Amino acid sequence: MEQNLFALSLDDTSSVRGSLLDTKFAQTRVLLSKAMAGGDVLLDEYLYDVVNGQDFRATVAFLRTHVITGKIKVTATTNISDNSGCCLMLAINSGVRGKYSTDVYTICSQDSMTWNPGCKKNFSFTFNPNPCGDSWSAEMISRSRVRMTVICVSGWTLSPTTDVIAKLDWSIVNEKCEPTIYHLADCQNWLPLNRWMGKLTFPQGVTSEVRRMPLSIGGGAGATQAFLANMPNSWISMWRYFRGELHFEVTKMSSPYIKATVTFLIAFGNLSDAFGFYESFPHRIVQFAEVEEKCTLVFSQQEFVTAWSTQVNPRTTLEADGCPYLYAIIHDSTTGTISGDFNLGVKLVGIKDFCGIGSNPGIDGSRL
Amino acid sequence: MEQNLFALSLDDTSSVRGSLLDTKFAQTRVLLSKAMAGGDVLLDEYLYDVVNGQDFRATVAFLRTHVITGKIKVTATTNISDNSGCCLMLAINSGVRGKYSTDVYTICSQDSMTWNPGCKKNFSFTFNPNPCGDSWSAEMISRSRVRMTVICVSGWTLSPTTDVIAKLDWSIVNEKCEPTIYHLADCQNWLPLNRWMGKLTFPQGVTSEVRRMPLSIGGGAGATQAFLANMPNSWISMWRYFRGELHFEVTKMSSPYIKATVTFLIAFGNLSDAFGFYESFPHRIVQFAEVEEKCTLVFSQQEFVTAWSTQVNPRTTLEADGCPYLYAIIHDSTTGTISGDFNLGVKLVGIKDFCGIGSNPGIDGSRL
Amino acid sequence: LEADGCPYLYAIIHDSTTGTISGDFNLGVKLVGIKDFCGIGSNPGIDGSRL
Amino acid sequence: PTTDVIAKLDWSIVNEKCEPTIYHLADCQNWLPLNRWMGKLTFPQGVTSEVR
Amino acid sequence: ENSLEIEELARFAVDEHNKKENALLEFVRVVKAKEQVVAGTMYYLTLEAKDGGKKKLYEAKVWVKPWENFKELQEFKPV
């Protein structure tokens, strides 16, 4: 029998939706070398080139659906014996410019998962590839040149026998795509940053190991006669002085076998190494279990008297630098049956109750 | 963040479902030659080979879904000027054997659409490729060798300027797959058949044109020193005598321009041509409009006194043959501005209130 | 395998077999039982094992 | 291991009812136990597409 | 039509054409592909390949028997 073809449901502009099987649209195969270093690009391709040569249930729906209101979930099913561990970081950035830096610092901003295969069997995270709207499409991200980058921030503490593979499973979940928009309001409730405060290596042994990371975060991170920049870190340097509850996220990057206990505290630069009374200050102890890999330090408003400067002159010494630092001090000693350093990654997630004062003319440099 | 991967919804055994866009799984391109004849295979391939080299929304879902409870809708969007017309027949059969017959008679049984592009803009029909169950799969029909066949039963009455194409759109709708199972109960409420009673050509002119089609349908249709067979027609010949309300479906195969009025009636073979009182019998007149193409004659139980035989000896003449015929008589004359015969296709759809008597030893032959 | 219309149970490595120590990733599958079992017909028999 | 190992089995008698497991020729059955060893699957260490 | 399979078949076309005719066409991409179920599958491909570093379009016909490792380039030509 005949029917009126104009009135059929062929102009169905639904988003992609269903179970996790029927929304999967690509799988990606990352090769982790037996002997990989820190700061080492494992994968680096455009997010649309992920879906080339694919034949999953939602692959054709993904390409052809004009609007998608759901987020992209990516899950990474990589594992390794507790004996070893490393730290991978997958990360999505809205674009590129020629001959780009792939230092962890540069990348992490915007949208990223960081995990240690040694501890976490798998790791998933959702994100919105259009950061200033509720929607996106396959055609948007192909032409916008959205860029996915997997990087190894810390090498294998004990190398596996053979090469490894990380399978990424790109799906579309059904959460609302909420936008992350930075703006120039002086008082903001939550200013996210995802600023890589730095990788902290502590060698195995007995010595007083102390690591300072300055909270004058603005004006990027260092290189040769050069400096690197995220957007959010460049954004916070718009203001001269600032303050707020700082929400760090400290992560283990070595294996579970390398054990160490770490005190974190706010304090000023003048304090030397071999000053044995760091626990006079208020502080937070961080022991990691075998399975735990991630821990969130928060430092309230009572840790800071006044606001402090976003940038400082590079040539100021630790002796005359009146902005606060975040100390990370080994409480006992770095130990283990196997050789390898106790790596530890600190990441300023965001500032709560942010208050930005003034208007930075700027400084030009990075570290303090 | 991590999640337990065993407990995700990746073992989703849902059927394919959604709009007609999201259930489309293949399109097929049939070429109709400018000068095509009757009994002419246009397309003939396995139903699973339809989906080879395809990239629609439900293509991968179709192949990979283990069970599908929905029917397959196929729609054919072929058209031509009212001036001309032909008769295509798409038809699905559960299998094959080497060097097979592709006569309309053989094919139509089971599941088929017949349409005239001249009248009907498009034509759709649903069907179940597993005829004895509620479900099927792509893997079932690939290995079962389900066979789709498009045939031209009547050529173009007036040829088009160029070659034509018929686009078939294979989808999966969400109707229940109901089985069609034949069985040996003597009284049945509805015995479907889809038996091709025959193509009736009436030339243009003035003469008394009369066409008899015997209702001793059993024992196939003729060939050389051979005969053809459907299953349902072989099934009805299991019984010796039978009766019931017969539901014919007479269809136009020529263009709308060739016009003719046709009386149908039940009567016995002895009645000659040039016997001018056919409308003494009870009868049914069939005029077709430009747009109408299909009309259903029903002949109640009051048209038949007793049951009649399913098969008759081939050598019985019309003079001594006591089973009823279905006459098709031109009421006026076959006319038109353009040359071409008035073709007309009769198809016994099924017998209602079927009553099968006895047990046929069999006869071996076809026509009477 | 090309012309065998019964189902298989596939077991596929999703990523890669790994470890600090050498040794294969052994894994033992055991069909415990069939629930809602439905047995049709009457096997004459075949004589052999694998397919 | 460094040395040989020993497994100590402790045979006791608990107080559960001894229920019988009897196979029979009913065509439809609710639970047909089998304990059929489908097979041991070795996957070597490495990167290749291993399918069993 | 699984685009991954077609990409591999298109590369096979350019590689077989190069072997057969002693050429050095550089494969760029597939543009068009038709699968037609036959005795096996027949593929009609339209693809871009660089001649002397110059992008050009070609038509290829490729016959595959999926039950064997049989792939055969039946014809290859510029459009």
Side-chain angles (χ1 to χ4, degrees), chain D residues 24-45:
Chain D
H24 50 94
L25 288 177
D27 294 304
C28 287
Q29 294 181 66
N30 229 24
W31 177 252
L32 175 70
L34 293 177
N35 293 275
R36 205 276 188 186
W37 190 250
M38 283 269 85
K40 186 174 157 285
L41 305 175
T42 194
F43 298 98
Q45 293 225 24

Side-chain angles (χ1 to χ4, degrees), chain E residues 23-77:
Chain E
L24 264 326
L25 300 191
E26 196 95 9
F27 173 81
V28 181
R29 59 171 170 105
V30 199
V31 179
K32 216 164 287 301
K34 303 186 63 55
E35 295 180 24
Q36 221 187 85
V37 175
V38 284
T41 312
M42 190 69 56
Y43 297 81
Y44 302 95
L45 313 176
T46 301
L47 56 85
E48 285 180 288
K50 310 174 85 184
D51 208 320
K54 301 142 179 180
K55 247 170 288 177
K56 284 167 178 188
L57 287 159
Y58 302 83
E59 289 168 334
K61 175 176 171 178
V62 179
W63 185 23
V64 169
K65 304 188 202 172
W67 51 82
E68 303 175 13
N69 60 355
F70 184 89
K71 291 177 169 201
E72 209 201 352
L73 173 67
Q74 302 259 87
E75 195 162 350
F76 192 94
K77 70 169 200 204

Side-chain angles (χ1 to χ4, degrees), chain B residues 169-190:
Chain B
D169 311 336
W170 300 89
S171 314
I172 288 165
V173 295
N174 223 26
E175 301 170 23
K176 302 288 182 206
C177 288
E178 292 207 327
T180 95
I181 290 165
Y182 291 85
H183 50 94
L184 288 177
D186 293 304
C187 287
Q188 294 181 66
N189 229 24
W190 177 252

Side-chain angles (χ1 to χ4, degrees), chain C residues 12-36:
Chain C
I12 299 146
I13 228 75
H14 191 40
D15 45 78
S16 93
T17 299
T18 39
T20 49
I21 59 164
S22 61
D24 289 350
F25 179 69
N26 291 316
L27 193 70
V29 190
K30 184 214 204 70
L31 175 42
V32 175
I34 309 179
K35 182 190 203 303
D36 213 317

